């Protein structure tokens, strides 16, 4: 299934590049931005649009063109992600992503990658218009993408407000605060977004149904960012494909929050003295305080308990949607 | 008229900030981003929406609420501009704007201002939904803002492709190329955008009419960027409110294009040896080559000839719109 999704990408780059004449060099650059930046991940968020589309729509309405609209809106979720990651990797001062150097760390790109990210966002709406203009769900999708863009930028704002360069923020790191950040920066666009899109494509616009689906899916995304945080420090970088910067970027990590509520006063000071600084030996002290506190073990328990809780929420809130929508998702993330 | 437009801004910040609870600090930050970044200019682009609204709509349909929608869509054109300038001042490595330091040069903002610009763009569509959701022109406006965002990002792309840091690009500087850049990066969102918005608000959706209005307005914006370029080097910075970076940023300026087509071979080499470098004495040599070539005089003639040409285009293409729409605009820019 991921094979057929990735092959559809060559067509979306054809249509996105078919505007060629005076703007020839800019189209080319956009091509190059698309290939470097949308390709290379797992495609879970975009495939999710398509998988749930097939589960929610009557197979007698799965026209070859309605299927193509589904492939395209899935790619739109991947361009959103790609827009946010490019910018995010500047702001976080990250080195690699998806096994290559962050695009803006490329000789000859640098801060021009701010335009480039902006262009990736613009492509969403060019795609929606080319494919979904005359569909009844056109405006609902535009509005969903825009709203999930806003929520994600609110989350980024808190993410950064909470993590100033060169400033001990330890007291700012609460669970309350952690949950607010990940709710907005991650849960909306990675989980609620692609399910909600498929739903509007299937003519399920009921407000209580999106709410119920959102109840489940926001908690899934909350787990997924907890996982992202854990793996920033403890993930095999030949697997994750990205070098981690949380500690040096002085971030409100699940890890630090959990550390802070188990640390002795002496341990608090090790963190105070060592967190949020670019010196490897400083980063190493924190990682070792985390390992001494048995945080990989705590993560593993939390992963078990969150899973049980998410499945209980599917029991409560999935109907009248097929549970398989939410269960295939949970399979993929846990 | 600019007084009543600027006073409406306090209400748009109220509504934009009325989402307050967990996201309290992010709303606050957004407030601060709005005030620093949307306030402080001349407001010509946003007022234009409102002025043309009053000229295009039947006064018996200028409800107090339809007038409020007009004020709000004008502010939406100013948030677009503000989104683009913030990012632009990073990418151009500018120092000041509107008489204060570029926002991202502010202690404690830096590259976080990438999120901030993104948030400013998102506010357009939050405003359109709060005020224009149930209007017949809702989707036409969303689509116009999005499309003018794309075109502007295509223009930025060429602007930068054409001006690499530390690389003699002289041969790349043509008129053909100059015109393509300013067409996209400036003409669409500063001139066609606000007139077209007012037009859709007045229920003038005719395709040939937008084309005709666009014929006039794209050339006005082409002049306006030529003016912007001239003033980057020759403008009183107590008036312009911004320090110029064109030469050091190795940019395809109207000035350089014009220089390059009048320079002697020896003069070409002065430019080759001196353009696109951060050394003040280097910048000074170029400025003096421009003054020796009598470019302020050439600009002044071009300003006269472009004006005559724009007014001839108004003769041809304004009908059935009131010429006053286009004439008030020309007054403001020349
Ligand atoms: O991929 P990354 O940088 O680990 C991340 O997940 C990317 C990201 C970007 C925007 C919203 N949410 C997550 P972050 O929170 O920055 O750690
Ligand atoms: O205000 P600036 O930087 O003079 C400018 O006009 C700003 C700008 C931003 C985006 C599109 N067009 C103009 P630029 O072309 O960068 O010189
Ligand atoms: Mg990041
Ligand atoms: Mg981040
Ligand atoms: Mg991370
Ligand atoms: Mg600039
Ligand atoms: Mg610029
Ligand atoms: Mg300029």
XYZ file of C-alpha atoms and ligand atoms in Angstrom:
708
model
C 0.000 0.000 0.000
C 2.901 2.392 0.777
C 4.273 1.390 -2.660
C 1.261 2.733 -4.596
C 1.191 5.930 -2.493
C 4.843 6.697 -3.180
C 4.412 6.053 -6.909
C 1.561 8.621 -7.053
C 4.046 11.291 -5.975
C 5.612 11.485 -9.427
C 2.210 12.643 -10.806
C 1.726 15.346 -8.133
C 5.129 16.727 -9.007
C 4.159 16.641 -12.708
C 0.966 18.678 -12.104
C 2.711 20.999 -9.627
C 5.454 21.632 -12.245
C 3.168 21.956 -15.326
C 3.000 25.776 -14.891
C 6.131 26.112 -17.128
C 7.628 29.934 -18.479
C 9.378 33.026 -17.090
C 9.113 31.262 -13.709
C 11.054 28.216 -15.076
C 13.857 28.318 -12.545
C 11.414 28.740 -9.653
C 9.353 25.719 -10.686
C 12.561 23.649 -10.883
C 13.588 24.817 -7.414
C 10.123 23.826 -6.133
C 10.525 20.339 -7.682
C 13.827 20.012 -5.902
C 12.242 21.193 -2.626
C 9.488 18.585 -3.040
C 11.757 15.667 -3.708
C 14.212 16.442 -0.940
C 11.524 17.269 1.582
C 8.322 15.288 1.059
C 10.022 12.007 0.061
C 12.005 9.874 2.497
C 9.717 9.193 5.453
C 7.347 6.383 6.330
C 4.245 8.166 4.839
C 2.041 7.075 7.713
C 0.065 10.354 7.870
C -0.691 10.472 4.149
C -1.477 6.765 3.834
C -3.835 7.150 6.731
C -5.974 9.478 4.620
C -6.194 6.792 1.953
C -6.672 3.785 4.235
C -9.538 5.471 6.111
C -11.015 6.683 2.820
C -11.328 3.066 1.668
C -12.886 2.066 5.034
C -15.337 4.984 5.202
C -16.548 5.233 1.566
C -18.952 2.802 -0.180
C -16.857 0.717 -2.588
C -19.442 1.499 -5.298
C -18.403 5.162 -4.894
C -14.647 4.438 -5.040
C -14.399 5.736 -8.613
C -10.835 5.745 -10.031
C -10.960 9.546 -9.746
C -12.349 9.623 -6.197
C -9.427 7.337 -5.327
C -7.040 9.757 -7.017
C -8.496 12.602 -4.945
C -7.787 10.415 -1.891
C -4.129 9.866 -2.910
C -3.742 13.602 -3.502
C -5.261 14.693 -0.091
C -2.934 12.176 1.610
C 0.027 13.838 -0.138
C -1.401 17.151 1.013
C -1.074 15.894 4.607
C 2.557 14.972 3.798
C 3.283 18.455 2.366
C 1.884 19.999 5.508
C 4.195 17.825 7.600
C 7.067 18.665 5.208
C 6.333 22.400 5.466
C 6.433 22.182 9.259
C 9.556 20.006 9.478
C 11.708 22.173 7.235
C 10.998 25.244 9.292
C 11.195 23.237 12.523
C 14.784 22.063 11.821
C 15.926 25.627 11.398
C 14.281 26.614 14.679
C 15.474 23.544 16.570
C 18.969 23.721 14.873
C 18.821 20.138 13.801
C 21.432 18.447 11.714
C 19.771 15.512 9.913
C 16.387 14.318 8.963
C 15.241 11.170 7.213
C 18.837 10.065 6.910
C 20.098 13.183 5.063
C 21.154 16.626 6.264
C 18.322 19.026 7.071
C 17.684 20.799 3.672
C 18.738 24.206 4.963
C 21.997 22.903 6.172
C 22.637 22.189 2.463
C 25.356 24.227 0.918
C 23.489 27.007 -0.896
C 20.097 26.883 0.785
C 20.434 28.135 4.338
C 17.653 30.587 5.195
C 16.223 30.547 1.663
C 14.527 27.412 2.989
C 12.034 29.783 4.670
C 10.584 30.612 1.319
C 10.817 26.924 0.412
C 8.751 25.802 3.432
C 6.153 28.481 2.638
C 5.999 27.150 -0.947
C 5.382 23.622 0.363
C 2.354 24.889 2.297
C 1.047 26.715 -0.786
C 1.165 23.451 -2.744
C -1.501 21.924 -0.476
C -4.057 24.421 -1.722
C -2.928 24.196 -5.336
C -3.576 20.460 -5.127
C -6.910 20.779 -3.424
C -8.035 23.149 -6.193
C -6.778 20.975 -9.045
C -8.431 17.851 -7.760
C -11.207 18.767 -5.296
C -12.567 22.089 -6.540
C -15.951 20.767 -7.620
C -16.396 18.317 -4.734
C -18.886 19.040 -1.986
C -16.125 18.736 0.659
C -13.764 21.305 -0.966
C -14.261 24.119 1.530
C -14.324 21.703 4.527
C -10.892 20.425 3.564
C -9.361 23.886 2.975
C -10.706 24.938 6.359
C -9.380 21.766 8.052
C -5.848 22.181 6.675
C -5.787 25.850 7.553
C -7.116 25.200 11.056
C -4.693 22.387 11.703
C -1.910 24.718 10.405
C -2.941 27.332 13.010
C -3.178 24.919 15.893
C 0.257 23.526 14.964
C 1.746 27.044 14.926
C 0.192 27.724 18.346
C 1.891 24.542 19.567
C 5.239 25.498 18.064
C 4.850 28.858 19.854
C 4.463 27.237 23.250
C 7.170 24.710 22.403
C 9.627 27.611 21.920
C 8.298 30.109 24.508
C 8.898 27.229 26.937
C 12.417 26.515 25.722
C 14.496 29.738 25.506
C 18.150 29.411 24.388
C 20.491 29.845 27.381
C 17.942 30.197 30.141
C 17.112 27.689 32.943
C 13.362 26.983 32.513
C 13.091 24.043 34.835
C 10.095 25.358 36.819
C 8.170 25.884 33.545
C 8.282 22.054 32.910
C 5.019 20.627 34.111
C 2.809 17.797 32.905
C -0.036 20.287 32.462
C 2.282 22.327 30.198
C 3.757 19.334 28.428
C 0.256 18.148 27.444
C -0.769 21.536 26.160
C 2.298 21.756 23.929
C 1.938 18.301 22.285
C -1.844 18.634 21.965
C -1.335 21.600 19.618
C 2.030 21.074 17.960
C 1.558 17.413 17.076
C -1.762 15.771 17.857
C -3.899 17.903 15.474
C -2.012 17.618 12.216
C -0.556 14.132 12.493
C -3.666 12.216 13.683
C -6.942 14.185 13.719
C -6.140 15.884 10.416
C -5.856 12.831 8.072
C -8.767 10.941 9.654
C -10.975 14.073 9.560
C -10.061 14.628 5.900
C -11.095 11.139 4.863
C -14.307 11.670 6.920
C -15.246 14.841 5.034
C -14.374 13.071 1.790
C -16.870 10.363 2.829
C -19.516 13.007 3.566
C -19.309 12.467 7.337
C -19.476 16.125 8.424
C -21.418 15.498 11.625
C -19.958 17.675 14.347
C -20.357 15.170 17.224
C -18.675 12.504 15.085
C -15.578 14.626 14.433
C -15.511 15.421 18.128
C -15.647 11.723 19.038
C -13.013 10.773 16.476
C -10.927 13.692 17.779
C -11.306 12.498 21.397
C -9.478 9.248 20.390
C -7.033 10.693 17.893
C -5.716 13.600 20.026
C -4.616 11.128 22.707
C -2.924 8.983 20.065
C -0.927 12.022 18.929
C -0.126 12.832 22.546
C 1.438 9.370 22.844
C 3.202 9.800 19.547
C 4.990 12.957 20.700
C 5.908 11.276 24.023
C 7.420 8.548 21.851
C 9.150 11.215 19.675
C 10.665 12.736 22.825
C 11.826 9.381 24.232
C 13.427 8.493 20.905
C 15.089 11.902 20.515
C 17.563 10.695 23.202
C 17.151 6.865 23.189
C 16.329 6.022 19.574
C 18.654 4.251 17.200
C 19.613 7.088 14.826
C 20.087 4.587 11.965
C 16.371 3.942 12.542
C 14.979 7.411 13.481
C 17.149 9.039 10.761
C 17.610 12.221 12.769
C 20.073 13.511 15.343
C 18.443 14.610 18.542
C 18.635 18.141 19.947
C 16.060 18.227 22.734
C 18.472 18.652 25.666
C 20.753 21.075 23.933
C 17.648 23.027 22.738
C 16.463 23.209 26.417
C 13.041 21.603 25.562
C 10.072 20.644 27.638
C 10.549 16.937 26.953
C 8.467 14.141 28.273
C 11.766 12.871 29.586
C 12.685 16.019 31.514
C 9.195 16.430 32.924
C 9.350 12.816 34.187
C 12.950 13.342 35.406
C 11.969 16.473 37.280
C 9.241 14.710 39.233
C 11.551 11.889 40.410
C 14.848 13.738 40.927
C 16.434 14.306 44.301
C 17.436 17.908 45.143
C 21.029 17.010 44.257
C 19.718 15.526 40.998
C 17.653 18.649 40.238
C 20.933 20.612 40.400
C 22.727 18.254 37.980
C 19.925 18.989 35.555
C 19.969 22.712 36.414
C 23.720 22.806 35.925
C 23.628 20.701 32.672
C 20.366 21.026 30.692
C 19.955 23.196 27.667
C 23.604 23.568 26.723
C 25.506 22.590 23.539
C 28.440 20.837 25.259
C 28.356 17.064 24.577
C 29.672 16.238 28.036
C 26.815 18.278 29.501
C 24.224 16.427 27.333
C 25.898 13.179 28.507
C 25.396 13.933 32.192
C 21.663 14.429 31.667
C 21.305 11.265 29.576
C 22.985 9.403 32.408
C 20.748 10.998 35.021
C 17.803 9.777 32.861
C 19.258 6.234 32.674
C 19.974 6.309 36.471
C 16.313 7.265 37.031
C 15.215 4.334 34.848
C 13.317 6.417 32.353
C 13.522 3.963 29.447
C 11.663 1.606 31.820
C 9.139 4.326 32.661
C 8.512 5.049 29.030
C 7.899 1.364 28.401
C 5.248 1.173 31.144
C 3.634 4.398 29.933
C 3.540 2.950 26.404
C 1.631 -0.043 27.809
C -0.793 2.075 29.864
C -1.448 4.645 27.149
C -2.237 1.777 24.704
C -4.800 0.303 27.082
C -6.317 3.788 27.565
C -6.447 4.542 23.818
C -8.241 1.188 23.166
C -10.740 1.946 25.917
C -11.379 5.291 24.202
C -11.941 3.438 20.908
C -14.505 1.242 22.735
C -16.320 4.363 23.979
C -16.030 6.687 20.977
C -15.407 4.893 17.669
C -19.066 4.130 16.782
C -20.503 4.532 14.241
C -17.114 4.495 12.537
C -15.452 1.129 11.887
C -13.080 0.472 14.807
C -10.604 -0.804 12.224
C -9.996 2.877 11.333
C -8.554 3.565 14.745
C -7.078 0.070 15.309
C -4.920 0.105 12.203
C -3.589 3.444 13.388
C -2.786 2.191 16.869
C -1.053 -0.842 15.294
C 1.157 1.526 13.297
C 2.248 3.767 16.196
C 2.727 1.234 19.131
C -9.337 57.634 6.464
C -6.039 56.031 7.605
C -7.086 57.074 11.142
C -10.261 54.943 11.165
C -8.415 51.972 9.611
C -5.704 52.016 12.266
C -8.271 52.278 15.068
C -10.041 49.122 13.783
C -6.844 47.175 14.462
C -7.470 47.101 18.205
C -10.689 45.100 17.535
C -8.970 42.554 15.245
C -6.422 41.930 17.959
C -9.276 41.530 20.478
C -11.024 38.864 18.345
C -7.720 37.186 17.430
C -6.841 37.013 21.168
C -10.307 35.957 22.470
C -9.324 32.241 22.287
C -7.992 32.474 25.905
C -6.673 29.010 28.127
C -3.794 26.507 28.170
C -2.529 28.398 25.099
C -2.436 31.703 27.094
C 1.235 32.425 26.566
C 0.989 31.661 22.843
C -1.924 34.049 22.337
C 0.055 36.780 24.139
C 3.073 36.126 21.921
C 0.791 36.386 18.863
C -0.548 39.753 20.121
C 3.005 40.953 20.462
C 3.832 39.675 16.952
C 0.805 41.547 15.577
C 1.578 44.852 17.186
C 5.257 44.859 16.316
C 4.702 43.619 12.791
C 1.400 44.772 11.301
C 1.451 48.275 12.841
C 3.903 50.974 11.777
C 3.564 51.320 8.008
C 1.516 53.567 5.764
C -1.384 51.021 5.399
C -1.794 51.779 1.716
C -2.535 48.154 0.719
C -5.182 47.602 3.387
C -6.834 51.000 2.948
C -7.017 50.291 -0.735
C -9.367 47.391 -0.013
C -11.642 49.760 1.882
C -11.442 52.731 -0.486
C -12.301 50.571 -3.515
C -15.035 48.823 -1.527
C -16.755 52.182 -1.003
C -16.355 53.034 -4.727
C -17.550 49.652 -6.024
C -20.484 48.875 -3.669
C -23.932 50.561 -3.734
C -24.077 52.895 -0.723
C -27.470 51.351 0.138
C -25.576 48.062 0.641
C -22.823 49.614 2.800
C -24.317 48.158 5.989
C -22.256 48.865 9.146
C -21.328 45.166 9.110
C -20.445 45.024 5.405
C -18.150 47.974 6.148
C -16.630 46.052 9.047
C -15.988 43.104 6.723
C -14.223 45.605 4.434
C -11.994 46.904 7.275
C -11.160 43.324 8.245
C -10.225 42.158 4.653
C -7.996 45.255 4.361
C -6.224 44.195 7.574
C -5.965 40.733 6.061
C -3.992 42.283 3.178
C -1.752 43.952 5.804
C -1.172 40.636 7.640
C -0.187 39.039 4.370
C 2.325 41.827 3.769
C 3.479 41.500 7.408
C 3.892 37.724 7.050
C 6.033 38.227 3.950
C 8.151 41.070 5.352
C 9.118 39.300 8.561
C 10.398 36.302 6.680
C 11.895 38.524 3.973
C 14.101 40.436 6.468
C 15.594 37.207 7.706
C 16.332 36.105 4.145
C 17.634 39.493 3.025
C 19.522 40.001 6.387
C 17.987 43.370 6.939
C 18.523 45.461 10.000
C 15.522 47.803 10.358
C 12.018 48.121 9.177
C 9.408 50.790 9.766
C 11.858 52.665 11.939
C 12.552 49.796 14.391
C 14.852 46.779 14.227
C 13.589 43.858 12.154
C 11.594 41.751 14.739
C 13.933 38.775 14.497
C 16.912 40.872 15.218
C 15.195 41.449 18.594
C 16.974 39.983 21.530
C 15.110 36.729 22.190
C 13.308 36.192 18.902
C 15.841 35.305 16.237
C 14.657 32.348 14.153
C 11.540 31.810 16.279
C 10.206 34.559 14.015
C 9.693 31.805 11.405
C 6.860 30.430 13.430
C 5.697 34.000 14.050
C 5.470 34.830 10.320
C 3.567 31.579 9.722
C 1.144 32.582 12.510
C 0.572 35.959 10.832
C -0.479 34.172 7.636
C -2.821 31.881 9.590
C -4.563 34.939 11.046
C -5.780 35.971 7.576
C -7.944 32.874 7.362
C -9.104 33.094 10.966
C -10.361 36.588 10.168
C -12.003 35.635 6.925
C -13.900 32.881 8.759
C -14.981 35.077 11.667
C -16.301 37.823 9.462
C -16.938 36.472 5.942
C -17.955 32.847 6.450
C -21.562 33.280 5.367
C -20.872 35.761 2.557
C -21.166 34.683 -1.052
C -17.559 35.799 -1.727
C -15.989 33.730 1.114
C -14.352 31.061 -1.029
C -13.289 33.604 -3.716
C -11.376 35.563 -1.100
C -9.689 32.512 0.485
C -8.639 31.421 -2.991
C -7.364 34.925 -3.879
C -5.214 35.233 -0.745
C -3.837 31.747 -1.178
C -3.098 32.322 -4.863
C -1.447 35.654 -4.250
C 0.587 33.935 -1.462
C 1.812 31.346 -4.006
C 2.674 33.839 -6.696
C 4.582 35.912 -4.114
C 6.556 32.835 -3.005
C 7.374 32.061 -6.653
C 8.682 35.626 -6.943
C 10.738 35.358 -3.768
C 12.193 32.134 -5.229
C 13.402 33.859 -8.370
C 14.514 36.873 -6.342
C 16.872 34.585 -4.369
C 17.823 32.039 -7.074
C 18.994 35.144 -8.955
C 20.965 36.557 -6.042
C 23.243 33.889 -4.478
C 25.465 34.963 -1.543
C 29.099 35.290 -2.687
C 28.680 34.560 -6.365
C 29.002 37.003 -9.324
C 25.606 36.800 -11.105
C 26.009 39.757 -13.387
C 25.021 37.935 -16.602
C 21.782 36.751 -14.926
C 20.641 40.450 -14.610
C 18.377 41.173 -17.521
C 15.292 43.330 -17.953
C 13.343 40.229 -18.992
C 14.402 38.619 -15.684
C 13.910 41.737 -13.610
C 10.294 42.017 -14.827
C 9.537 38.402 -14.095
C 10.795 38.733 -10.526
C 8.802 41.889 -9.609
C 5.680 40.677 -11.425
C 5.460 37.747 -8.989
C 7.104 38.911 -5.781
C 5.397 42.294 -5.571
C 2.804 43.184 -8.181
C 0.259 40.456 -7.247
C -0.112 40.934 -3.520
C 0.407 44.671 -3.186
C -1.854 45.903 -6.038
C -4.000 43.244 -7.751
C -4.808 41.545 -4.450
C -6.584 44.407 -2.568
C -8.461 45.688 -5.631
C -9.560 42.135 -6.560
C -10.740 41.546 -2.982
C -12.942 44.623 -2.946
C -14.241 43.519 -6.399
C -15.314 40.090 -5.136
C -16.828 41.779 -2.091
C -18.864 43.911 -4.531
C -19.962 40.790 -6.426
C -17.821 41.628 -9.471
C -16.513 38.116 -10.205
C -16.426 38.507 -13.980
C -13.246 36.920 -15.266
C -12.537 39.464 -18.047
C -12.995 42.287 -15.530
C -10.398 40.889 -13.117
C -8.107 40.395 -16.082
C -8.556 44.018 -17.173
C -8.095 45.362 -13.653
C -5.036 43.098 -13.365
C -3.599 44.427 -16.655
C -3.443 47.929 -15.034
C -2.549 46.909 -11.505
C 0.356 44.539 -12.331
C 2.160 47.382 -14.114
C 1.550 49.664 -11.137
C 3.209 47.091 -8.870
C 6.047 46.744 -11.361
C 6.669 50.484 -10.983
C 6.341 50.237 -7.242
C 9.135 47.663 -6.978
C 11.332 49.741 -9.336
C 10.706 52.581 -6.890
C 11.487 50.234 -3.938
C 14.799 49.328 -5.595
C 15.741 52.950 -6.351
C 14.965 53.943 -2.768
C 16.856 50.987 -1.279
C 20.051 52.916 -2.213
C 18.837 56.538 -2.703
C 15.976 56.913 -0.227
C 16.107 58.996 2.906
C 16.201 56.294 5.607
C 14.415 58.628 8.061
C 11.621 58.444 5.470
C 11.826 54.823 4.164
C 12.418 53.547 7.739
C 14.633 50.706 6.558
C 18.327 50.200 5.890
C 19.057 48.985 2.412
C 20.801 45.701 1.606
C 20.315 45.226 -2.128
C 23.970 45.573 -3.184
C 25.382 43.620 -0.307
C 22.684 40.930 -0.908
C 23.826 40.742 -4.600
C 20.250 41.457 -5.910
C 18.814 41.855 -9.349
C 17.965 45.515 -8.779
C 16.397 47.847 -11.228
C 19.471 49.927 -10.569
C 21.999 47.219 -11.431
C 20.090 46.121 -14.512
C 20.090 49.754 -15.727
C 23.763 50.154 -14.695
C 24.739 47.022 -16.571
C 23.244 48.248 -19.831
C 25.097 51.599 -19.719
C 28.442 50.595 -18.182
C 31.717 50.646 -20.052
C 33.810 47.438 -19.936
C 35.981 49.070 -17.267
C 32.781 49.980 -15.404
C 31.424 46.420 -15.703
C 34.583 45.277 -13.872
C 34.129 47.806 -11.037
C 30.710 46.279 -10.538
C 32.076 42.736 -10.960
C 34.821 43.469 -8.462
C 32.456 45.261 -5.969
C 28.823 44.058 -6.122
C 27.308 41.643 -3.693
C 29.783 42.050 -0.855
C 29.306 43.210 2.770
C 32.205 45.705 2.855
C 30.895 49.300 3.106
C 33.681 50.649 0.916
C 32.682 48.118 -1.742
C 28.982 49.168 -1.520
C 30.229 52.788 -1.791
C 32.051 52.202 -5.067
C 28.891 50.828 -6.675
C 26.717 53.670 -5.367
C 29.208 56.063 -6.909
C 29.241 54.188 -10.204
C 25.407 54.546 -10.141
C 25.654 58.305 -9.428
C 28.355 58.666 -12.167
C 25.962 56.939 -14.600
C 23.199 59.379 -13.611
C 20.772 56.745 -12.454
C 18.757 58.968 -10.108
C 18.053 60.998 -13.274
C 17.128 57.840 -15.182
C 14.772 56.738 -12.474
C 13.089 60.130 -12.555
C 12.454 59.902 -16.315
C 11.229 56.316 -15.982
C 8.859 57.451 -13.215
C 7.431 60.019 -15.653
C 7.123 57.553 -18.553
C 5.677 54.715 -16.488
C 3.030 57.147 -15.106
C 1.969 58.159 -18.604
C 1.824 54.463 -19.602
C -0.192 53.435 -16.519
C -2.756 56.234 -17.215
C -3.048 55.121 -20.830
C -3.746 51.606 -19.528
C -6.453 53.043 -17.245
C -7.986 54.718 -20.340
C -8.029 51.360 -22.159
C -8.936 48.957 -19.347
C -10.690 50.607 -16.390
C -14.280 50.447 -17.745
C -16.751 49.548 -16.413
C -15.000 50.239 -13.119
C -14.805 53.842 -11.895
C -11.436 55.229 -13.039
C -11.188 56.852 -9.613
C -10.355 53.354 -8.276
C -7.148 53.259 -10.250
C -6.455 57.030 -10.143
C -6.452 57.269 -6.368
C -3.964 54.417 -6.372
C -1.674 56.064 -8.896
C -1.860 59.293 -6.842
C -0.664 57.359 -3.791
C 2.334 55.638 -5.425
C 3.770 58.416 -7.768
O 10.845 15.787 14.193
P 11.119 16.483 15.460
O 12.016 17.733 15.392
O 11.477 15.461 16.498
C 9.473 17.063 15.981
O 8.684 15.939 16.313
C 8.871 17.766 14.752
C 7.553 18.492 14.995
C 7.306 19.635 14.249
C 6.115 20.321 14.437
C 5.183 19.834 15.302
N 5.418 18.732 16.004
C 6.560 18.049 15.854
P 9.662 18.068 17.473
O 8.485 18.453 18.367
O 10.306 19.248 16.942
O 10.623 17.310 18.304
O 10.838 45.795 1.868
P 11.921 45.273 1.021
O 12.886 44.260 1.664
O 12.551 46.420 0.288
C 11.030 44.369 -0.285
O 10.326 45.303 -1.079
C 10.025 43.462 0.447
C 9.274 42.473 -0.436
C 8.924 41.253 0.125
C 8.234 40.328 -0.645
C 7.860 40.649 -1.914
N 8.186 41.822 -2.443
C 8.858 42.736 -1.732
P 12.241 43.543 -1.344
O 11.886 42.963 -2.712
O 12.729 42.506 -0.463
O 13.296 44.557 -1.551
Mg 12.004 19.898 15.812
Mg 10.121 21.374 17.139
Mg 11.565 15.428 18.639
Mg 13.606 42.184 1.464
Mg 13.178 40.414 -0.578
Mg 13.805 46.624 -1.438
